[PDB]
Design a protein that fits this description.
The structure is cut from a larger assembly and holds chains A and B. By secondary structure, chain A is α/β, with parallel strands linked by helices. Chain A contains two helices and five strands. Chain A has one domain. Chain A has a five-stranded mixed beta sheet with strand order 3-2-1-4-5, with helices on one face. By secondary structure, chain B is an alpha+beta fold. Chain B is elongated, with a radius of gyration of 28 Å. Classes of the chains: A alpha/beta, B alpha+beta. The PDB classes it as ribosome.
Chain lengths: 137, 191
Amino acid sequence: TKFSIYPPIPGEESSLRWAGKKFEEIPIAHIKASHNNTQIQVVSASNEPLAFASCGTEGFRNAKKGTGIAAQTAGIAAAARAKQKGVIHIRVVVKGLGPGRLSAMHGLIMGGLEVISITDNTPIPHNGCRPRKARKL
Amino acid sequence: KTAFSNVGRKISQRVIHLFDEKGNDLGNMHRANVIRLMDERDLRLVQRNTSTEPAEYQLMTGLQILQERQRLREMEKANPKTGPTLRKELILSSNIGQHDLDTKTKQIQQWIKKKHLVQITIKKGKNVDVSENEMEEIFHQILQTMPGIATFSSRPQAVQGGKALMCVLRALSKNEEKAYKETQETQERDT
């Protein structure tokens, strides 16, 4: 067949398998790319925490956490703890427009993990709560 | 300013005096050999004492890294020891108007009440000839407003070949205060 960019809906039967596992079963890599930090947490299909890493947990301080090298370092630290539990294929769910939004995705690949999808779950309200006032800096 | 958090897998110094999680002294070992123990037992290294010339690092579990600082959050709360003194500066002019001298004299009263150090400097007024007789009479005029609260730390000096005078003020020390108090009572009550 051809190749579609839309994810295979669970209900309808498909033929796309990864290591004999359906798309639903693949573990999920929740990335929260903030402006001053980047936390990464890998979970299974049944929401079971397997690995957690962040720039702070890798020995970075203050303004070094909001860089692209600290997010990549955090991906290698989470892709090395989850590869010992039998994780190879993951579903990336990026949340945030921070510096370590794409650099953490590269770090997960530098740990032996293969990314099959890229999901964006950045919080966008349909007017809800009021942000802080604009600054003059 | 430091925190009891893991340093990570990046060590600056090649030789470290590693310490066991249970407090056993592993002994000095190569930097590469330190990371092997962080994976073999999945433990994080924290620098216990920077001051010592030989690098000292202790590897403990994440729960052990939380309990440590969780006690440093109480020791400082129970017995806080913050003694740094901020230093403030003022640069006046001999011909400074009284109104501006009363506003700047009230600013010094807030600094002396917060146990700050006030560096006061006086300069020759614009196109004004004056000696150090009335140029040094402003310190005595400022200190008089604070009789007991403030006292000289340093004394007027010719910082810049005599054109300018610099002095430092401080909040009166507890002991000194008591002495001032004691003296005040005798003058009026005994009479």
